[PDB]
Amino acid sequence: QLIKLHKNSNGMGLSIVAAKGAGQEKLGIYIKSVVPGGAADADGRLQAGDQLLRVDGQSLIGITQERAADYLVRTGPVVSLEVAKQIIREIIV
Amino acid sequence: PELQLIKLHKNSNGMGLSIVAAKGAGQEKLGIYIKSVVPGGAADADGRLQAGDQLLRVDGQSLIGITQERAADYLVRTGPVVSLEVAKQGAIIREIIV
């Protein structure tokens, strides 16, 4: 699923970590946390654990942490992310 | 590495861990390492276990210097509460904000 975020001065509002998720041999980029108050938080679709596959068409799979982080910081005000959603977001009680 | 005793409470999806046999830098003996912590899983919810931590022992059974297949045999035959002895990974994971 594709997700477009409108960055503010604090950017996308994503804390990220490089890891090899269960079943994957390749290094991937994962959302550690969604910064409260930020663009990603307001959009609401992204959550901790989701994998960022592409940013503006560029692959974030099987590359070093430094290269992936560079691709993410060198984006424009509107960024297009290709996500892997890794079901119930909330529960009414 | 610092040692920690961890009593992990499983759920319906197990421990929520992906493990791998590898040798830590320097160590000659094979070790059982956490490759990944599954999001929303039991270990994830517990919060103490992290990728890179070494599982040394489970319910009194050693996991050091053994093949990867034997380790999984032990681990899947555990009860609801898993008594782990772990070696905490040393690296300081830097916060990357974008």
Helix (H) or strand (E) holding B71: helix B68-76
**C-alpha A74, offset from chain centre:** 14
Could you tell me the residue ranges of all domains in chain B? 2-88
Rounded to the nearest angstrom, the minimum Cα separation between B37 and chain A is: 8
b/e sequence B32-63, b meaning 16+ C-beta within 10 Å: bbbbbbbbebbbbebeebbbbbbbbbbeeeeb
Of B36, B39, B93, the CB nearest to A48: B39
Please judge whether B98 and A73 are an interchain contact, meaning their C-beta atoms are less than 8 angstroms apart. Answer: yes
CATH 2.30.42.10 fits B2-88, yes or no: yes
HSE-CB at A35 with a 13 A cutoff on CA atoms is 18
Please judge whether A11 and B97 are an interchain contact, meaning their C-beta atoms are less than 8 angstroms apart. Answer: yes
Instruction: Please answer whether residues A36 and B52 qualify as being in contact, where contact means their C-beta atoms are separated by less than 8 angstroms.
Output: no
Distance CA B33, CA B7 (A): 17
HSE-CB at B68 with a 13 A cutoff on CA atoms is 9
Q: In angstroms, what is the resolution? A: 2.1
A42 lies within 8 A of chain B by CB: no
A27 lies within 8 A of chain B by CB: no
Chain A residues with CB inside 8 Å of B93's CB? 17
Rounded to the nearest angstrom, the minimum Cα separation between A16 and chain B is: 6
Distance CA A8, CA A68 (A): 20
Its sign, for the CA torsion A89, B16, A52, A37, is positive
Q: Which alpha helices (H) appear in chain A, and where do they start and end? A: 39-43, 65-73
Give chain A's radius of gyration (CA, Å): 13
Tokens found for residue A22: 């269960």
B38 lies within 8 A of chain A by CB: yes
Please judge whether A49 and B35 are an interchain contact, meaning their C-beta atoms are less than 8 angstroms apart. Answer: no
Instruction: Please answer whether residues B47 and B37 qualify as being in contact, where contact means their C-beta atoms are separated by less than 8 angstroms.
Output: no
Distance CA B88, CA B98 (A): 28
b/e sequence A6-41, b meaning 16+ C-beta within 10 Å: ebeeebbbbbbbbbbbbebeebbbbbbbbbeebbbb
Short-list B79, B95, B89, CA closest to B34: B89
How many other CB atoms are there within 10 angstroms of residue B4's CB atom?
A: 14
Rounded to the nearest angstrom, the minimum Cα separation between A59 and chain B is: 16
For residue B97, what are the β-bridge partners? A15
First to last CA, chain A: 30
Distance CA A30, CA A21 (A): 9
Residue A89 DSSP symbol: -
The CATH fold assigned to A1-85 is: Pdz3 Domain (2.30.42)
- Sorted by sequence, the CB contacts under 8 Å of residue A89 that are 6+ apart come out as A47
Interface contacts (A, B; CB < 8 Å): 35
Short-list B47, B57, B53, CA closest to B85: B57
Distance CA B33, CA B17 (A): 10
Chain B residues with CB inside 8 Å of A11's CB? 97-98
Helix, strand or coil, per DSSP, at residue B44? helix
Residue A36 DSSP symbol: T
B35 lies within 8 A of chain A by CB: yes
| CA angle centred on B11, ends B10 and B13, rounded to 5° | 110
HSE-CB at B84 with a 13 A cutoff on CA atoms is 30
